[PDB]
Amino acid sequence: QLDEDSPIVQQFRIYSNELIMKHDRHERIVKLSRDITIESKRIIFLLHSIDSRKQNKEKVLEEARQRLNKLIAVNFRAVALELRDQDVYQFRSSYSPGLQEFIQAYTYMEYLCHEDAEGENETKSVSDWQAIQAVMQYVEESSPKKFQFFVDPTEYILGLSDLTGELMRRCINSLGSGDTDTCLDTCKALQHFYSGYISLNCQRARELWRKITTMKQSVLKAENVCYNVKVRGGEAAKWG
Amino acid sequence: SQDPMSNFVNLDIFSNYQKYIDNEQEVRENIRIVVREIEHLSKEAQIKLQIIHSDLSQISAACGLARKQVELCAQKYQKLAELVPAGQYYRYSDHWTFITQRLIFIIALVIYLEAGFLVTRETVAEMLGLKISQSEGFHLDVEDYLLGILQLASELSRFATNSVTMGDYERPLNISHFIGDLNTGFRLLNLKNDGLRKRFDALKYDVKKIEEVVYDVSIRGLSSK
């Protein structure tokens, strides 16, 4: 009985078109975010290779900066282009993993710059959401219109918290390789981040609360490394 | 100088974030106040419509009472719209999705009971003072509309059963046709594993309950025509 001319069939075909367009847009963003996530993890793996070994430091940060810049100029530009006339919160679940992994890699590279500072690079702040937002500014090709990738402060705070798992990993790798001054550096950084995070007074913020809980265990692990270094020596602290 | 790590781990970032989140919590609190006013109006419509399950002669009165409650909702939605900046609808929409689905259910139930047909998303938006398009202003999400009308089947299977108890043997067939057309519409959507598809997947059990009522009366040749 119901055919293509039935008002209810007409109506549901209108609803279906709206759901298809939404689903298609979600799928394109999920794919972009996946590739951002994969490349960010690769960049963090590259960053972890930095050691006393001299001719690696600057060369590694260089390649990491180039690969992070490509993600900004290509992949994040594609996501911002997709969301141009959209409510950015509607699709947050589609790009959130990529954004958080990118922020983790970006801030880890900044940490590593600060750590080997001989002079005034010690004065630099980690980039905050406004500083990262400022690198994600785009222009249509040909006057031509400006667009950006909106960086939600909550997404930033969540991404930055993952940096602390990287600090803890660097602390462990440094014990292994006998680079024990780096254990101290990463531990101080963890203590400072942890103090900043516990300063936060957030209602119903369940994801955040779990991050801080995990952060406490990273801080404790790094503090125990520095301890075993102090009491057993670099070498005997490796064996445990 | 004394502490280089305090430069890197800039505590202004955390105090800025505290301010951001405080500002947001204040908006959420204001939103929640308006949503509770909406919940109160929708409950009143819902209570009046429970009469369909025990007194068939009160259906049109209950429908009129509910339309009055629904009219009051649209005024509250304007207040909600005032609290929600452009570009931030989906920042806050978890606060009103459940009550909005519920009002859609109530509106669709009223229209089914008065006239026998399925209310459109556009008519529901008009009655709530909502735009159909986010570019136009504070809008009704099509997914909220679809989730709301799915609530129809459970209520209508309850009503099919009660109708027979009360001697109205034609109602279940009418409901069966109506829920059958709704089902046809939903299958048109070709939904994939997601939240909407999960809720669509429960519709079959209400379809089945209604078909059983239709079978019981037709197999017995029962009639109140």
Side-chain angles (χ1 to χ4, degrees), chain A residues 1-238 240, chain B:
Chain A
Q1 276 161 156
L2 292 184
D3 58 43
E4 285 317 312
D5 296 313
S6 304
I8 193 172
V9 171
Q10 297 188 68
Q11 287 149 31
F12 272 83
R13 299 223 182 266
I14 285 146
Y15 308 144
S16 171
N17 183 54
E18 298 173 18
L19 294 178
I20 288 166
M21 279 182 49
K22 183 172 125 192
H23 183 262
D24 285 4
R25 169 167 291 106
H26 168 86
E27 281 320 322
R28 302 187 295 269
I29 298 167
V30 165
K31 188 196 193 183
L32 290 167
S33 169
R34 278 185 191 143
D35 290 353
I36 289 159
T37 295
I38 285 171
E39 173 72 344
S40 295
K41 288 176 172 157
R42 285 179 190 160
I43 292 166
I44 287 158
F45 186 80
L46 171 65
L47 290 172
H48 274 307
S49 71
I50 291 165
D51 184 355
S52 301
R53 276 197 177 190
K54 256 194 172 175
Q55 278 149 53
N56 97 340
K57 294 158 164 194
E58 172 67 23
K59 295 296 181 220
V60 167
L61 297 171
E62 274 175 357
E63 183 189 345
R65 174 83 60 178
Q66 155 166 4
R67 301 168 65 164
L68 284 165
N69 286 343
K70 181 163 180 201
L71 288 173
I72 293 157
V74 183
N75 309 237
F76 274 103
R77 190 186 189 278
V79 176
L81 209 38
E82 193 73 53
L83 296 176
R84 270 197 101 169
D85 302 302
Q86 303 296 313
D87 176 310
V88 298
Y89 303 95
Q90 189 182 10
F91 291 99
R92 58 182 157 194
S93 81
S94 305
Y95 60 77
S96 184
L99 178 61
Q100 289 180 21
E101 198 78 19
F102 176 82
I103 288 174
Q104 177 183 0
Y106 194 88
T107 56
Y108 187 41
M109 194 198 59
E110 294 191 318
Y111 166 78
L112 289 173
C113 292
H114 185 271
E115 182 190 86
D116 86 331
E118 277 177 13
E120 69 273 8
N121 282 359
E122 287 205 322
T123 70
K124 296 168 82 180
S125 165
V126 70
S127 284
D128 71 345
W129 56 85
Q130 308 171 54
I132 303 178
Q133 171 84 79
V135 316
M136 279 175 197
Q137 300 290 326
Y138 308 110
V139 183
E140 294 185 34
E141 283 147 86
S142 145
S143 101
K145 291 213 190 167
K146 289 198 270 176
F147 64 103
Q148 63 172 10
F149 177 93
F150 174 75
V151 179
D152 169 55
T154 291
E155 290 293 315
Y156 168 92
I157 283 291
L158 289 177
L160 178 77
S161 71
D162 295 337
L163 166 63
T164 68
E166 300 315 317
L167 300 176
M168 197 236 304
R169 273 145 228 145
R170 177 162 186 76
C171 187
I172 293 153
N173 294 340
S174 294
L175 173 64
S177 56
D179 180 24
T180 71
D181 280 20
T182 298
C183 301
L184 280 181
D185 294 353
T186 54
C187 181
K188 285 167 195 153
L190 283 166
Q191 292 174 325
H192 276 72
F193 272 115
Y194 184 67
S195 296
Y197 274 87
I198 64 164
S199 79
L200 299 175
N201 286 307
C202 287
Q203 306 172 18
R204 310 176 182 223
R206 216 178 172 201
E207 209 161 337
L208 185 51
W209 185 95
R210 286 181 303 225
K211 296 287 189 185
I212 299 170
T213 294
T214 301
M215 190 177 308
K216 196 188 164 51
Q217 300 306 303
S218 297
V219 170
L220 286 178
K221 272 171 189 154
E223 288 178 345
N224 285 266
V225 169
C226 294
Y227 168 84
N228 283 297
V229 167
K230 178 80 184 194
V231 306
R232 313 197 132 82
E235 259 126 57
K238 297 170 185 164
Chain B
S1 282
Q2 281 197 352
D3 193 13
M5 204 57 195
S6 296
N7 303 321
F8 185 73
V9 179
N10 183 356
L11 298 182
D12 291 344
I13 296 172
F14 296 95
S15 75
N16 288 343
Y17 184 66
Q18 192 62 68
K19 296 178 192 168
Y20 186 78
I21 286 300
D22 289 355
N23 281 344
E24 186 191 297
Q25 289 174 352
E26 196 155 34
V27 183
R28 293 190 181 284
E29 276 159 21
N30 288 333
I31 289 172
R32 282 188 202 104
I33 294 176
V34 176
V35 173
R36 293 170 202 127
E37 294 173 354
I38 299 177
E39 298 168 4
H40 177 95
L41 299 168
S42 64
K43 292 294 205 182
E44 171 74 3
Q46 220 181 335
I47 299 160
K48 298 301 175 176
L49 288 160
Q50 284 295 299
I51 204 74
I52 71 177
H53 302 299
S54 61
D55 193 343
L56 302 174
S57 68
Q58 294 198 53
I59 289 177
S60 92
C63 284
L65 296 172
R67 289 184 165 269
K68 293 310 263 182
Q69 294 306 299
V70 161
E71 291 174 357
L72 300 172
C73 290
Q75 326 187 338
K76 303 303 184 179
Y77 275 106
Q78 197 173 30
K79 292 176 189 204
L80 205 46
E82 299 171 17
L83 291 175
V84 179
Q88 298 174 43
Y89 184 100
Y90 292 97
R91 186 173 182 187
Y92 296 114
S93 63
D94 277 349
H95 284 269
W96 64 84
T97 53
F98 175 91
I99 194 48
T100 301
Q101 292 169 18
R102 184 102 269 161
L103 287 172
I104 288 152
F105 162 66
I106 285 158
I107 293 165
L109 182 60
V110 169
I111 285 170
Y112 166 74
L113 292 169
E114 292 173 351
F117 67 86
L118 175 71
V119 69
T120 62
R121 175 280 302 274
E122 180 166 3
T123 293
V124 176
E126 295 173 337
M127 285 171 71
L128 289 175
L130 293 173
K131 302 297 180 184
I132 62 166
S133 196
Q134 57 191 78
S135 72
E136 298 162 349
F138 193 90
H139 71 290
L140 169 63
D141 191 305
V142 73
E143 285 199 356
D144 275 358
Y145 165 79
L146 294 170
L147 294 169
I149 63 169
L150 286 166
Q151 295 179 29
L152 270 182
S154 354
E155 189 67 21
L156 294 176
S157 63
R158 184 176 171 210
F159 185 48
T161 294
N162 294 137
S163 291
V164 175
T165 300
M166 291 182 287
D168 178 356
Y169 305 121
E170 289 69 56
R171 184 109 241 177
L173 191 54
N174 185 112
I175 292 173
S176 182
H177 289 164
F178 176 82
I179 295 310
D181 291 351
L182 194 71
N183 197 32
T184 295
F186 274 86
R187 301 176 184 277
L188 251 41
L189 302 181
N190 238 287
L191 302 168
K192 347 201 158 197
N193 287 332
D194 78 315
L196 193 44
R197 217 226 153 174
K198 273 178 203 174
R199 305 210 223 154
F200 167 73
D201 288 337
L203 167 75
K204 66 181 163 193
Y205 305 110
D206 300 314
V207 161
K208 179 62 160 164
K209 185 169 141 195
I210 294 153
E211 284 324 295
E212 297 300 346
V213 175
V214 171
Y215 175 83
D216 292 338
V217 326
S218 82
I219 205 74
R220 292 169 170 80
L222 294 173
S223 171
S224 55
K225 278 153 199 149

